[PDB]
């Protein structure tokens, strides 16, 4: 499923992730158009075994076990399968868990290259919410 | 430490055009905002514009056509130029770092002062 | 552009009591508001963000408040250290605006 950027942040926002440890609502918008361009069903494969699963792109050598990555630690312990759903939820409780604080963002290279330093609420400004 | 300081002329007349120095350290210019902000004697703060991390500009209505600002990543000064300069231009300036819609850090400001 | 209007101008109270200053916005600012101290002689400090997020370090007995249009920072058992000015600032879009300004200060 291909998010549009209003409909995503309002599913962001019924979650918990505004202003979550700190970071604005178009920080979370802005990553997912970076990291899948807004689909939950993005993939793809490193360097090494690992893979990285939907709309924000969760590794799986560590968050998510695909039972297939070398040395997998599944932190969110969950299968990186569940996170490839259009139910945001599962993704959203993973990166809660990756996002320990107000520097956590890093966790996504995408946003800290492309997004912060940027004027993200351009992403959620004209949406309902 | 994040660190700003604000270097100005002093004092200056309507017939120069100012130029104010605000070095940061602590911090990447490409990662965080930088907003100049003044407050004339005994008045409250006024806003004047920003550079976002990625260079782009935005300016206060009113006096958008005398100001520019502009910076130097490799440097790490932020500058704020004026022109037309007016004796309601007295006033104290700050830059400021914006992180994520908040300004957190504050310059001590430099004062200035617009004779005749 | 969105223009803020803070009251009261100045609040004169004792140690120990609670206070409410507040800003109104002419426009929907959507919670991008914050709230900062400046003492006599040193540069604006920050308390709260996003409406109510209080900035590392700021003792809670501030809290802020408000949604849509109006809102307000309230101060509980005001200390010493309390006095000063106090300005509110939206970040909704560009041009940002700041309230005029309340001092609060010694009864």
């Known amino acids: 499923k291909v998010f549009g950027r209003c409909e995503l942040a309002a599913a962001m926002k019924r979650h918990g992730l505004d202003n979550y440890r700190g970071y604005s609502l178009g920080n979370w918008v802005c990553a997912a158009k970076f990291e899948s361009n807004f689909n939950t069903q993005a993939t793809n494969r490193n360097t090494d075994g690992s893979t990285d699963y939907g709309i924000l792109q969760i590794n799986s050598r560590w968050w998510c076990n695909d039972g297939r990555t070398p040395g997998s630690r599944n932190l969110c312990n969950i299968p990186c399968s569940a996170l490839l759903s259009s139910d945001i939820t599962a993704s959203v409780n993973c990166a809660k868990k990756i996002v320990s604080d107000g520097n956590g963002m890093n966790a996504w290279v995408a946003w800290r290259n492309r997004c912060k330093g940027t004027d993200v609420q351009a992403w959620i400004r004209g949406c309902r919410l | 430490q994040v660190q700003l300081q604000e270097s100005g002329p002093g004092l200056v007349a309507p017939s120069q055009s100012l130029s104010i120095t605000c070095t940061v350290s602590?911090?990447?210019?490409?990662?965080?905002?930088v907003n100049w902000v003044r407050q004339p004697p005994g008045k409250g703060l006024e806003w004047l514009g920003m550079?976002?991390?990625?260079?782009?500009?935005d300016y206060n209505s009113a006096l958008k056509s005398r100001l520019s600002i502009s910076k130097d990543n490799s440097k790490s000064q932020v500058f704020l130029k004026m022109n037309s300069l007016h004796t309601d231009d007295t006033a104290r300036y700050y830059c400021?770092?914006?992180?994520?819609?908040?300004?957190?850090?504050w310059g001590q400001g430099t004062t200035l002062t617009v004779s005749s | 552009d969105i223009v803020l209007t803070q009251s009261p101008a100045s609040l004169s109270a004792s140690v120990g009591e609670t206070v409410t200053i507040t800003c109104r916005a002419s426009?929907?600012?959507?919670?991008?508001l914050a709230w900062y101290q400046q003492k006599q002689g040193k540069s604006p400090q920050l308390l709260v963000y996003?409406?109510?997020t209080l900035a590392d370090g700021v003792p809670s007995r501030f809290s802020g408040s408000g949604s849509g249009t109006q809102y307000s920072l309230k101060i509980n058992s005001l200390q010493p250290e309390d006095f000063g000015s106090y300005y509110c600032?939206?970040?909704?879009?560009?041009?940002?605006?700041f309230g005029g300004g309340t001092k609060l200060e010694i009864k």
């Open positions: 550079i976002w991390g990625d260079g782009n500009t």
């Open positions: 426009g929907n600012i959507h919670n991008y």
């Open positions: 400021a770092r914006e992180r994520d819609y908040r300004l957190d850090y």
């Open positions: 600032q939206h970040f909704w879009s560009t041009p940002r605006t």
């Open positions: 996003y409406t109510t």
């Open positions: 602590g911090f990447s210019l490409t990662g965080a905002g």
